Design a protein around this ligand. Structure first.
Ligand SMILES: [Mg+2]
Ligand SMILES: [Mg+2]
Ligand SMILES: [Mg+2]
Ligand SMILES: [Mg+2]
Lengths: 440, 440, 440, 440
């Protein structure tokens, strides 16, 4: 699946729709980023710039100018073509090819932005700019506005009003189109296939990073070159560290391993977590904690639908958790009192759900305590977990267990669609999958 | 192989040896680096900071203080331990464990650096600081020195002399110790194994990125998690782009593929290039260019030794290249005149060799045109290539061919040791390897 | 005359009137300014901050918060009282005395601005801020907004809209109230008295700076301590330099001297220019140029009224100038053609009029080429001049003559009031004044 | 008196003498400084830049290059000539006239500094730069050094060593030459004449600022246009504020007035303080405090000579003060104990002496607690004072009295020369001077 030329066009028009007349919106590309000395990390475009362009070069700026309700036009600033730079670092779109390729009206050289941008903003009333996003952008925009401010005698005038477009644009990104959902559907499949493979490859004596290697390879073979975030493979006590990325330990027979990994496919993030026994067989103590987390997830998948909220579903999860922990004697006392005391917090110390899209932790307003009413087209994670510290004052058998199970969903008209259920999570199905792989 | 505690200690003492008495050297850690929104790229420590510490955290500063020729001491600033931050983002060394772990005399909290650093520099004559390396470092150091300058009444005095330690430190990094050579030897093996695997896996119809996937997996399985630079898989005309990293094309029967890839193992870079036929059989035209590049490499490996230079060996390569190209009718005229006219430059437009170590393009002074006399312990690449543009005015059969073959060497007392010859480069050996793999 | 507490209150309410509901306006004080080493220039408050406060301290910020059309409140940030700082550098208002003294609802310590400002902006829709005015202000405001932006989880929200208040505020300053006009009336008298004194004191052999000394003393004795701009005393060829401030030359019998000087009285600027003979008697050649400039001024004073513009009156001045210069043979040709060719520009190269108020070159929109229709309460200068270069190709007798004559006016319902006519400008009156003084 | 061309040359050579071979020193001009909107304060050159040039323009940089012990040369960057800018803002030296005028070898356009400076620093070992002095300077210098650092391939190398020249240069400024002493001698006379005039003009009912007006006029008439610091006229309780500059109060019969004022003559500062009765007759209570301060000054003038220190003379002053205050019953107890308890500090809370020169608070190392041994050619103030707070718990008659008496001296081979004794300080002489003036 992919995002069409027409879709990028629709998004741009949807933004312009909301802009005031006599205004321009400025959306800047991500800078290149040093890894060490003269080597740079693989380039990752700004998510918002990408959203409106699908253009993967640095030193580029989209300018959308609204004259009035029926008249608007677009200017791109981008890198000029350069034979020497392209012999070294590969091909550039240039100015001639850009209008047709990216559906913009005009394309100018980024090297001329300071000579041209103030002319585009001259006489406008409003400029939409994400102030503080990038320092190079702020310098360019402030420089433009100062020229206009100080150019009274040359009949120049600056727009007096600057508006942050991030609220508006992030509100757009919160609701996925059918194309975006199709792309996320494929990202979920690719990520699921990686997680299945890691379960099938896991043996005692392999290192945590070996499963990372397996996951990244499977991403790559379906055309998702990069992960959406740094892969987490926490075996044993490392499963209690939420964003454990060291992945440096030998995986031991008897321990669980928690894998939190997601591919980036056409810009969009998958995000799955599966926890499983390194030796293919859950112990009683491991099953006792796993079942509480699995019930939390399964109940959440039942409940998520238009008209509820992350907060409301989280309340049901907390009840399931506190009840389970009381039965194991990890918590002591009255369930409802323990709930009112937030007694689950030593063991479940993060949110159940975050928005998902072009960013793994996606943009969009949550409301207070994530109370926002859910609507169709919202995409989110469902990731309950229980993490019992090595030193927790609880029965010995539960200490140092970290379990998280995560699926990705889209809210539909009548409920949700699960994008990641192609990798197993019922414990008997996990064990059957690993047994089958160990034969072969 | 690894770098010992004692070695990090020796390096620190070797730097202190060269410092003036009444001085302090400040070596700052790399900042964390955003990939997108709240996600960061995998952390990569500053190479120079790493060189003296083997410490892989951000927000850390090594301070080496030389009182005189027999008296010196060390202070580390580093992140304080924090239960909440460590539940999320993993374990921190802290201040208590640091002296023993990293062999420093004292460790203080990075959050107190502005309250403590000026006290350490007070009354010194010289400060060694890599000015402009990092903006956060410059702010901290300038802030410290201004306090001292303005604190006459509190009996404070700033050192009046600031010296850049990068020249001195990079001169140290230029000469590898036996431990470093052993680590680079293993990086060369790991990288070689990845390149062999890519040759064995290559089939027509696979994408360029699939070989990248194979290479990265093989790095990972020997404990080199990350590449030392962004992997280059340029098939067909993409082989003419020197740092081609898009790797987005279907590999076609009839084309060559150029793979430039290197692992990062215990901080140190491998860097191998192999070019081979996608279908396992070189054409006549491909052999004709490949043989010139291979002869260049093989002759360079013969020649590199103490007492010569990259410049001197490059002159021999140019002769081999110009002679070969004249025989194919790619160049026309007298060889010696064509050499004097640099007529090879349209086809070979980069250097033959760069320093290799903690950085793939390593630190250390080259001399004018890389004329520096080579000595034992220098580590470098040998990477001749020929790149005939799709539109070059040459016989049709040579157009769009890009070939590079690269080995990594260490200069020894009597010559060089090749670190990367465990992956084949003779064409008959390449073809035999691929045939064998295709059976299965 | 002075500006009342009630007037500062009216101005604040007039600004609030124009603000959107759910907004705050931030007006910052001028920083202190180094003259050399640890000595600072006499403090000059930001004109706009002063306009709303009459408060003459640095490190202060007025915050006007509009909740809705009937509800608004004010917060001042200002320096805390400090016994040690006040023993040295004099008394501070502090927080306790500020509400009553300056008519604000609340006063907080400037040292707490970063802990308090984001709380005041939290949940607002709009912030009025003069971006780029002062770097220390921008740092404080950007810092506040970033806290709010990043504080979603703490239920913080930044205003998405930032508006420049300078256009609105400068439009207010363009129209003087009766109090402001009374203050400017007194500034005009004080400045006039200084100019009369300089004419009366001038003798051949005195230096240009001696008249500067006389002028500054007379300002001071009427309670205007500082000039509104650096005093210009250009005798001879120095009169051809428009902002000549060196004032370093001996004044010679035979030369004219041009004095451009203005006091600053209760914040408001006087601005008078008088040119006169150093020896008390105009030569024929000097009278010939002086009369053209005087006619220009006198005609302009006749013409300025509601419904005309600086541009329209300038056209009449140009005609007078070109006609006069043609009669002297300084210009050759047809008057109307010479006008169309802007042939006056080598001799009159500045504007006839600028706005006057808290700044000598006051704020307020001029329109294209100063075409804005004049209305009652606008205050402006009328300053025609002719400057014939030492090397101009004109009859010898006119070379090196610089003459400017300037009055300050307020536009009234039926014309203008001249604020500066108490110092003479008719040449016979100048000569009589100097003769009388020489007896002284 | 003035500073010769030859003297500026000697100073430059004296600096070069101390520089390392293969080095360059960079001395930047002061920036222009805004007073309000488009008006700037009178320009004041950087004292150190002035010291080596006597050049009073902004946007200028002196570069002194030492090749070795017998070879050095100078480059000036300065503003290019511009007819339009000079019609407005006066004449510029330019590049052609600068070598001869300022005795430099070469002069280049400041607008080309970024294209030229790195070429001057290329291949040098050391750069002397006053880091942090001016932000525009740091930008230029860092920019130059980064070009050199990054220009290995263009055979560029940066100096690795940066040294602050301020310590060296300020040590030079600490010792005045005969020319400088002659100029300071005249500054002392001019300042003395101003102080005499203020005493002669003072009447009850005049404002504090009126005496400021008298002082500034007298500075001006001897060719010292500007004061060296903001004039202090503290009558009554305002005399207890050390740097009182408001000067806003009516001077009342019965009160003392403290005048601290100094001219700036050819760059050099005078600094005199005289305290006297507003009505021309000291009361008993006023005489009782005045006599302690006068004895302190007179004893200090006796004592100051080579081989003592500000600290050592201050100890004698403290004894005189504590003894006097005990006799008046302002202090109670044993003199030697009260001295050991620093019991004088509520009444004398500043230093007795500061260095004087191009800055009123001049450069040069004081030593701990101003213990530095004095040598011939050091120039300093002698300014004992007693300030009894309005609310001090002391006999009523002493409350709200602030008295300071200050002379300026140069240390000679056998003692000191008083530069400011031409204005009276014995009380009977003050009273006779005012009586005589009142007749006016
Ligand atoms: Mg256990
Ligand atoms: Mg071909
Ligand atoms: Mg003449
Ligand atoms: Mg009294």
């Amino acid at each position: 699946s992919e995002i069409s030329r027409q879709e990028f066009q629709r998004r741009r028009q949807a933004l312009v729709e909301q802009m005031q007349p006599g205004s321009a919106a400025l959306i800047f590309a991500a800078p290149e980023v040093t890894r060490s000395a003269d080597s740079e990390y693989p380039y990752r475009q700004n998510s918002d710039f990408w959203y409106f362009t699908g253009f993967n070069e640095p030193e580029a700026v989209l300018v959308l100018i609204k004259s009035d309700d029926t008249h608007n036009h677009s200017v791109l600033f981008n890198r000029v073509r350069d034979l020497t730079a392209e012999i070294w670092f590969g091909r550039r779109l240039g100015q001639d090819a850009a209008p047709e390729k990216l559906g913009v009206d005009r394309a100018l050289a980024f090297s001329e932005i300071n000579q041209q941008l103030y002319q585009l903003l001259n006489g406008l009333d409003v400029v939409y700019h994400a102030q503080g996003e990038y320092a190079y952008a702020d310098v360019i925009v402030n420089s433009a506005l100062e020229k206009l401010r100080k150019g009274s005698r040359q009949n120049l005038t600056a727009p007096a009003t600057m508006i942050d477009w991030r609220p508006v644009v992030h509100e757009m990104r919160l609701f996925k189109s059918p194309e975006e959902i199709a792309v996320l559907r494929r990202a979920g499949e690719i990520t699921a296939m990686a997680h299945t493979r890691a379960m099938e490859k896991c043996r005692p004596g392999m290192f945590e990073y070996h499963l990372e290697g397996e996951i990244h390879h499977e991403f790559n073979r379906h055309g998702a070159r990069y992960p959406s975030y740094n892969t987490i493979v926490g075996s044993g006590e490392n499963g209690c560290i939420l964003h454990y990325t060291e992945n440096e330990c030998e995986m031991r027979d008897g321990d669980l391993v928690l894998i939190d990994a997601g591919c980036e496919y056409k810009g969009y993030a998958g995000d799955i977590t599966r926890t499983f026994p390194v030796n293919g067989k859950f112990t009683q103590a491991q099953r006792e904690i796993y079942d509480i987390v699995l019930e939390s997830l399964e109940t959440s998948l039942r409940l998520y639908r238009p008209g509820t909220s992350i907060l409301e579903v989280t309340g049901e999860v907390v009840r399931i958790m506190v009840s389970g922990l009381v039965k194991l004697g990890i918590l002591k006392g009255d369930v409802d009192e323990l709930i009112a005391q937030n007694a689950h917090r030593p063991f479940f110390m993060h949110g159940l759900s975050h928005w998902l899209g072009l960013d793994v932790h996606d943009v969009g307003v949550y409301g207070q305590d994530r109370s926002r009413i859910l609507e169709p087209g919202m995409v989110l994670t469902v990731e309950p977990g229980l993490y019992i510290a090595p030193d927790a004052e609880v029965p010995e058998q539960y200490r140092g267990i970290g379990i998280r199970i995560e699926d990705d969903i889209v809210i539909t008209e009548t409920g949700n669609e699960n994008l990641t259920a192609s990798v197993v999570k019922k414990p008997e199905e996990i064990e059957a999958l690993m047994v089958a792989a160990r034969k072969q």
